[PDB]
Each structure stands twice: as structure tokens, then as C-alpha cells.
Write a protein that binds this ligand. Structure first.
Ligand SMILES: Cc1ccc(O)c(Cn2c(NC3CCN(CCN)CC3)nc3c(C)cccc32)n1
Lengths: 426, 426, 426
């Protein structure tokens, strides 16, 4: 199932065996709550005043390679719907369709078909029972309105993750079933609703004509079940005796990779992706589209089809990288890097250089004064032995500070340092 | 109103037409809640014990160019007030002035005039009605105390945004009216209270002599209605056939710019600023003070009055930048960059290079495997055609990795690469 | 007590006098809540249905030198315990020991001794009193279950800081006393429980056999009361008349330093550390282990025992750094940098260069259009006058863009710029 390979030659590891679940687009839906414009006998007297204060508040409300990523507007789609609800009659168009039912699709003015929902009916409640047991239904239906108000006030009207007050599980699962997507998307979203909530936006919209409206921006997973893999990289330095004469090298192309429509979506920020079992939930807005030949950098970093990105330095500090099925340890200098078991203690001492250890039998990794716990996910690891490529470079002609560089950029910068020695032969 | 210009020569865009609302200073106010030191008939028995537990908890509580920004202490002003409240008698000085009223100004010991507030009076409530209808007022007045306690415990005593429990809308708006500032500030803060909350701090202070105190740090908007504009920049690379031989260039001076007292405040992190309609709420602590000649970089990047900051690389990856009134697309390589309408599909395919499209008629922008929604704010855009300045450079003498550089730094580094060729003429 | 020294020669300051409280390891504990599998008289009718909905939800739930830091898995230890609770019989092993008591240690299958806790007993409550005063105990015991559910749903099952619903103060303090650590750790954690909460994780685990379980990951403070100090650095540029001909220099080794087992733990991100009085709560996962000779860079930056890290540029923009006992001001160009008192106004105007001022007598620092408040902590400051080291460099042979560099890297790069002039003598 989940496997992992470590490349001693490049001091990197690839955790493959995952499945994709990428957000490609958005789905907007207008959630409405009908309100009553109002102006045992004493319990409602103080609970109805919370209603007058929530409406009072809501009216005051409306009235390494990460630097290469694009800069988009996340809620640009949802706000594009709220500018339509501000139009005259566009509110009554929704209030008319949501008359005899709570779920109805309303074709808006600008050719936008939105799935509207009437999740709460306070107008039909305050005007039917609160005109001079039922205090329970009021104190509970009003409590949800207060909670929607609290989230929209301490967030300037944009909520994420979408809480159960903006959309209950019964409303959300019913909204997932009714929205028109494939059967694979419907069950993927239904089995991981808390992930859909974290990738969803609740946008305060308008209060007009006894109605509170707010758009719930939901993710569309156009890419499902395609192979994904996470690349872990660590510095690869030399281990010479005299400190300072050491040169380093680090693959900067680390992050989440997923096959996507002939190309490969690369997420340089592994926190934009979320792993549930072997499923990887990412957001394409934080991605880069790369040719599928980018995977060649793991096996052969010197391949001619893709220029693998690296960074160079002389800072040979020790660091560890907890991988999906093990840990990469870059031990340099006088650092004490060990790998220990829970009930037995230290089982391996890392020699100077970049080494690797699997989580099978290892519980913690110690580098210096820091203790790192390894992930105990079951999986098979593989150690691909090889000569560290940092030994292939001459330290005297090695560029000591390149960050947005690659294998070829370093090689093409070394060769014209060897043009200066064509004058040295005088 | 809101306009935008795109510069093809520099692959950048300027969204002008905004108004300023910058936080220049702070305003401290001590919010107090009087407590009763205590030690239908059974409802209060379990509600009064929440009071004993909240007080028990609170006693345990107290007892690109972003790297150029300054490093300040945000709550340095508010904490400077809490060290004054710990002084002996300084608590009783407040408890004495807040005797017959809830709002009173207390001149503190170190020459600090603070606007004190008694938002809740539990001592006057527990000692007047809870000694052996009113269970409502207790269960609601005590519920606010519990909520103030919950926020101060899960935040180590510092709360932002200031919730309605720390300061209700009635208390906040009354605190805004009573604080001594100009009439323009009072209405700006009163119409955007949820923005003031997000720029405010609630700092737990002290519990001494039956009183709970906490300072609410409020923003002062010394700069209002001055012109602001947001600069969007994208990489500008060459489109040669052989990949790798391409050189790139990107204006690093992007962010929010606002005219401010002869100079211009520059916010390199556009997330420190918040846009409501055409108003821009920024925080000067995340700003840089630049000469007003910085705006010359948009029209002429080679102007002699200001050295426009750029960064160079050979990484010609495709990226898009969703602007205020459109989108900038930097399409390089085999990437499929398109701009589509909602109900009609693709309307433009971007050729290789840096192009631009306005939101009038365009709903989405596709670059690679990513879909970006454009902001649908109404405004007039302008395409300033011009020769891309990256064509003016020779790739063989082009510095391939400069980040904290400028136009002159590149030109002064190219010329001494042309001193090496004065030896080449042998 | 708390002191501070400013180094004019290197434009840096060291705030010493602190004590350490570093998280070295974790402590896992399984928190359990027994549930009843169910399927004045009408109050429970709607409160018991919240119980059926919380269980319904939870079942859907489960079923500068910062780039040198390591990459670990924070909850790798806690999740390693939840994979053990999913084993058959491992749930009943816990449900058996927590029979006659609420606190009991359960030795798990994989040789893991965990301190289990039964914080809530709803099975013993619903099955003892809710089969056809007590509505109070139900509406309050059920309200905690709802709050644990709300946090676990809007956070995908991982909560931090651990709220009082996951673990009350009575349960937490009792869990701190019963866990086996030294007496110094027990009182350190008991006096700063809100800090322990912010460094703790609440991980949703399993619902099986009428039991809800979730692991609370607690910090272990293996390093206590060792000396700590925070290094503040600011750019140090030249003040030549013609702008652009100026060279800059900045010590990149800023952050929190703490003596730790012969070495020194360095935290380049000062936000990973938390200061309470003179105690510094850090997390070693965001640390680097450096030789104790790193402190030599403050007194003599040119010392031969450690290569002090610096960065160079030509960007002479003005910036300020609010220190622990004062403020560092780097005033360059036409910027107006002042230091003012509260009741008297400007008391010092900063000349061009890097200067410093103590908080004794100063309340604010103004640099450009920004107002910075100084921290008013009582302490003695010291101004170590010295020649700024930037004057020791020739601007014509000064590397204008080095970030991951040091004193020796610059000196070894200057000398081979002086090899090019051995050809200039022709
Ligand atoms: C080694 C390293 C590690 C992490 C880090 O954030 C940086 C900072 N940094 C540099 N490096 C500068 C400039 C280029 N080089 C200049 C050689 N003449 C080296 C010093 N280029 C950057 C780019 C392009 C984007 C974002 C950050 C960049 N460098």
C-alpha cells in the first residue's frame, strides 16, 4: 500500500501510494434564514431580546519553492454571488421559490443557477406562536441564529471552516447529495465532511426584506484517485574535518506531487494538503503545474529531461526530517544524532552525513537537544544506496549561496569559474 | 471610482482609487467587572457554582520585501497599563470613581488618563438579590463572565478580535463616541465596528479587591481619506524556444501603498491591510516609509529618482495574479493559460509571455491545472502596451539569482561583467 | 534581574537574565467518556436529542535562519497511541480498569503505560436516572460533551490549545500531580497551566463499545531554570551622502538562545517561545543545537571560534526593533526617527546610522510614519559603544546580495575579488 524510498545520493525520500482529492473549482449555494420584524410568559421576554440584538449586530456587520505560487482570490466566486443578491427583486426571487419548501434552485438574474436552502424559519415561527414546550423550540432555534451572528462578527463576515451552525450535517449531507456532481464526488464528500468543512467558506451576504442570506462556498473535487506522492528533502553536506570548508546541497523541489491531467500538480507547502488514510486533500490554488518528467529527479537528479532545483550553502548545521514511513537525519559536526526505541533505548548512532532510518522498530529520533517522534504508519521502506552527489563538486569552485538555482545553473556557473583558470596558466 | 492600469513593459498592475484608514497609534481603556466574594431555589445553586469556577480559573490565569519590516511589540502600550493597575491603591482609585456611574475617566498615578468602564456589576447583583425572573438576569449576566473567562484561558490572557463579551456593541459604540478624537474618526469607527474589533486587543490584567479588570487596546486612525493603491507584480521572462536559456525578472515592490504625510507608507504584506468598499484598513507597524517618488516605478521603471526593486531568476514557471479589476497571467513553456466566461467558455488563449485581462466579461482564469476566479468589482481597466523590459538584457551577462536587488544593482553588476571582456580582446 | 546590552559595533542587543522552560518530550494520556447507547418531563426530551446528535457527529468524524529548522511531526506520539486503541480488546482493557475509579493506569498491548482518565460518566448517568434537579446535571454534563464535539468537528479531530472541556482545571492539575516527573516540573506546570494548555494537543481517537476516547498530548519540560537570552539585530548600513552607494550588514543569528546540556538551543522564530515574567517557554522542535561558542558573536563578531552569520545588501531602508528593555533604531536616508516620552514629547532625534535607546524614560519610538511602543519592563540597559563594523569594508568589493553567509564567507569572497586586481597591475 503505502511505500517509501530513500535516496542516499540526493538525501531525499519519496512517499508514494497515495490517492488524490484536489479542489479544482467552487460550488456556491445561498443559505437563507427568514426573520420576523418584531417590535413561562417571561422566559421568552429575555430570549426574544437576544433576537433583537443579533439582528442589530448583523445589520452593523453588512452596512522552499512557495514564492513561485500564484496569487488568487479565494472567495472571488462567493462574493460574485453576493453582489447579485444586493440587486432589487433578487431577494424576493429567492423568498418566492422558498415558499412551500426549504430546498429549491433559483435561477438568478445573471444566468447563475444556485441551490438555495431555507435552513431556519423564524418568521414562520415568531409570527405563528409568539403573538399575545414552545420556549424550547424558540430558545434552540434562536440559539443557532446567535451562533451564526457570533462567527460572522469576529470574522468580518467570512467563516472557515464552515461550522454546523452555518450548515448542519443533515443540511450539508443533503446539500452534497442534491448538488450535481459525479457519484464518486458525492461519496468522497459524504465520508469526509469535516474535511469539506475545512475547505469551505461561509460568507455573510445581506439582510433585506425579512431575510438573512449568506453564501456557503463549497469545494469541487475534479481530480480523484490519481497517484500522489510527497517528497522529503534534507541538506546534503560534506563531512571534512576542518569546519567551514564544507559545502552543502539541498533539493528545493519538496512538497506534495499528484498526477493531474497529463501534467503533475506540485504543492510546495505541505500544509495546504491534508492526509486522511492514503487520501490527500489539496487545494490547487496553492499548486504549480509541472511536466510529469519532474519525477525523474528522484531516481537520477542529473537527468537531461528536467532541471532539478537545488540550493547551495556552507551552513552545515544538523537537522532531521520526519518522513511518512521513517526519518531523514542530516548529522554534521559534533552533533549527537541517534535513533531510539521506546522500551530499549538507542539502537543506532548516525555517522556524519545524511542517513535514513525506517519507522519499523524505531519510535523516536534524536538530533542534538531535540527529540522527534516518527510517524508510526505501517508501510514498507526502501534504502536506495548511492554515492552522495555533493562529493562530485570541488569546494573551491562551488557557488556558496544559490537558492533559486538548479543542477544546470550550478554546472553552468562552475564552468565559467574554470574560464578564469584559462588565464591562470600564464 | 476604482480604476486599474496594467504595464506590459514591467508585467505589473496598479489598482488606484482607494482611501486610507491606517492605524497610527493605540487607545487604552480599562474595562472592569465588579465581583462578589461569596462562599427556582435550586437553579442558582448550580449557576452560582459556575461563578466560583470562573473566578477560580481567572485567578490561575494571572497568578516580497516583508523581511525589511520593523519588529515591534503590539501590546506594549496595553501591558504598560496593567503594570500600573498592579500598584496598591490604583485598583481602589478605579473602584472609587466607578461608584455612582458606569463610565468615568480615572487619572492614574503615572500621569495616564484612561477611560474606565463598568460593563458588568455582579457585586451589586449577587449582594442585592442572592442572599437567603431574577434567575434569568443572573444566568445571563454570569454567562458573559464565563465567556470572557473562556477566551482569556485559551489565549493566555490576550484576545483579538475583541469579542462582544469583552465589549458589547452598545459599550463599544459608546466608548467610541466618548473617546477624544476627531469627528471623522468617530464615524469611521462607528460604521466599521467589526474592523475595529479585528484591530483591537483584549488583555487580561488583574483580579484584586473584588474587581476583575482587563485593558481593551483600541486603534487610532490618524491617517484617513488619503489616496491608496495596490501594486500587483508577476514574473516577466523571455519566451525562447530552448528551455533553460530563458531569463526572468519580477518587481519585488508589490503591496499596498498609501500617501501619508508627504511620504508613502508601503505595506509589503497585503494581508495586513483589509479592504471594505474602497476603504483600506492597514496597520502601520507592518509598513515601510518610502519617498513619494516610489510611484514613478509604475510608469518608468528606469527612472533616475528611485531605484525600483526587482528580482532575477531562470525559473520560467507559469503563474497568475488575480488583481483588483482583472488578472495578470505569466504563461511560459507548454502551459495552457486561458481566460473563460461563465456561460460561454474559453474566450482568450494566452500566448507565451506576460499578458493581462480585465474582469469585464471574464469570470475565471485558468493557468495549467488551476482555476482562479477573478474579482467581480466594477471598475475601468487600462492596458498600457509596451516592450517587455526583459528583452533589453543579454542572457549571457544576466545575473541569474538576485533577490534583494534593483534596476541599478543589476546594471552595475552587468557592466563589470563587461570588464571581463576587455581582457577577452587579446 | 533582567538586563540588556546594546552593541553599537554590530547593531545588535542581547536581553539576558531569563530562565528556561523547554518542551523536550511528550506525555500521552487517554481521556475517556462513557456513553449510553440509547434509542420537567419534556425538558430532557430535547436535551437528550442533542446527545444523539453529538454522537452522530463524532461517528462521522472518525469513520532569519528559520529555513534551517528540522521538519518533524508534532502529534506523531499521540497518533501512535490511537492506532493502539483501535485494536480489538484494547478498548475493553481501558473500560475494565476504569470501573470502580475515574483515574487508573492501563498498561497497553505494545508495552505503553498510559494514565487513563474517566472525566465524564454519562452511561452511569443516562442508565441510572433517565429510564421511564436532575435535568440540571444532565443539561450540564451533556453540554460539555457538545463542546468537545464542536471543537473536534471544526478542527478535524485535533485541538490546541486544550480547552477546559477536553480537560478541566481540576482534571488537568490532578493529571499533572499524578504523572511521574520531578517536583520542579510539577509546580512549573501547575503555576502556568494556560501555557501548558497552549503547548498541548487534544486528538480525537475512537468511539467503540459505548466509550468515547481521545488522547491528550502533554508537554514534558526536561530543561528548566537554565540561562536564556534573546538576541535582537537590526541592519547596519553606511550613511554616505549619495544614496545607492551605501552598503548594509545584518546579523541573521537572531532569536532565543538557551543553554541546554553543554550546547545551546537556538530558536530563530521568537514566536515559538513564550515569555512569562522571566521564564521562557519554548518548543525544541523549532530549535537548532549550536555550540556554546555562539554567544561570542555578541562581544566580538570577528572571533575565530564561531563564524557569525550575517547578510549583506544595498537596501538602506529605515527600521526599528523594539527590544526587551528598549529599542534599536536603524535610521538611514531622509527618515525622521525620534524617541518620545508620553507627557513631554520628543526627547531624542536619531542621527543617521544604527542607534539605541532604553525604555527608562522613553514610552514610544517613531521611525518614519510609524509609532512603536517600547516594552515597559523594569531592567537595566547598557550601551556598549564601538566602531560600526560596516565602515571596515570597501563598498567596491563588497558582496551586495548575500543572505546565507557569514563573516568568513564575506571575507573569503572579498579576497578573490582582490585576486582580480593582481591582473589590474599590468
Ligand atoms: C540560501 C537561501 C535559503 C533561504 C532563503 O529564504 C534565501 C533568501 N532568498 C534568496 N537568496 C539571496 C539572493 C540570491 N543569492 C544571491 C546570490 N548572489 C543568495 C542570497 N533568493 C531568494 C528568492 C529568489 C525568492 C525568495 C527568497 C530568496 N536564501
Amino acid at each position: 500500500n503505502i511505500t517509501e524510498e530513500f535516496y542516499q545520493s540526493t538525501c531525499s525520500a519519496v512517499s508514494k501510494g497515495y490517492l488524490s482529492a484536489l479542489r479544482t473549482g467552487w460550488y456556491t449555494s445561498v443559505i437563507t434564514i427568514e426573520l420576523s420584524n418584531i417590535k413561562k410568559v417571561k422566559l421568552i421576554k429575555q430570549e426574544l431580546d437576544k433576537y433583537k440584538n443579533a439582528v442589530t449586530e448583523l445589520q452593523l456587520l453588512m452596512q522552499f519553492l512557495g514564492f513561485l505560487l500564484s496569487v488568487g482570490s479565494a472567495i472571488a466566486s462567493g462574493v460574485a454571488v453576493c453582489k447579485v443578491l444586493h440587486l432589487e427583486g433578487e431577494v424576493n426571487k429567492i423568498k418566492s421559490a422558498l415558499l412551500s419548501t426549504n430546498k429549491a434552485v433559483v435561477s438568478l438574474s445573471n444566468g447563475v443557477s444556485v441551490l438555495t436552502f431555507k435552513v431556519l424559519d423564524l418568521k414562520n415561527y415568531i409570527d405563528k406562536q409568539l403573538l399575545p414546550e414552545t420556549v424550547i423550540e424558540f430558545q434552540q432555534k434562536n440559539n443557532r441564529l446567535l451562533e451564526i451572528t457570533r462567527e460572522f462578527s469576529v470574522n468580518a463576515g467570512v467563516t472557515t471552516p464552515v461550522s454546523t451552525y452555518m450548515l448542519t450535517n443533515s443540511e450539508l449531507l443533503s446539500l452534497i447529495n442534491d448538488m450535481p456532481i459525479t457519484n464518486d464526488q458525492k461519496k468522497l464528500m459524504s465520508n469526509n465532511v469535516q474535511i469539506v468543512r475545512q475547505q469551505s467558506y461561509s460568507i455573510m451576504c445581506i439582510i433585506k426584506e425579512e431575510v438573512l442570506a449568506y453564501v456557503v462556498q463549497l469545494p469541487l473535487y475534479g481530480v480523484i484517485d490519481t497517484p500522489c506522492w510527497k517528497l522529503h528533502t534534507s541538506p546534503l553536506c560534506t563531512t571534512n574535518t576542518k569546519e567551514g570548508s564544507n559545502i552543502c546541497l539541498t533539493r528545493t523541489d519538496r512538497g506534495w506531487y499528484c498526477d493531474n491531467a497529463g501534467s503533475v500538480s506540485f504543492f510546495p507547502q505541505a500544509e495546504t494538503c491534508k492526509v486522511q488514510s492514503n487520501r490527500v486533500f489539496c487545494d490547487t490554488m496553492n499548486s504549480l503545474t509541472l511536466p510529469s518528467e519532474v519525477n525523474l529527479c528522484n531516481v537520477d537528479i542529473f537527468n537531461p529531461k528536467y532541471d532539478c532545483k537545488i540550493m547551495t550553502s556552507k551552513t552545515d548545521v544538523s537537522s532531521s526530517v520526519i518522513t511518512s514511513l521513517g526519518a531523514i537525519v542530516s548529522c554534521y559536526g559534533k552533533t549527537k544524532c541517534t535513533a531510539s526505541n521506546k522500551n530499549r533505548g538507542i539502537i543506532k548512532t548516525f555517522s556524519n552525513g545524511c542517513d535514513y532510518v525506517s519507522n519499523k522498530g524505531v519510535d523516536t529520533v534524536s538530533v542534538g537537544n531535540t527529540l522527534y517522534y516518527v510517524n508510526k504508519q505501517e508501510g514498507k521502506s526502501l534504502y536506495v544506496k548511492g554515492e552522495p552527489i555533493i562529493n562530485f563538486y570541488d569546494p573551491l569552485v562551488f557557488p556558496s549561496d544559490e537558492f533559486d538555482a538548479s543542477i544546470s545553473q550550478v554546472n553552468e556557473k562552475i564552468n565559467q569559474s574554470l574560464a578564469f583558470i584559462r588565464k591562470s596558466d600564464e
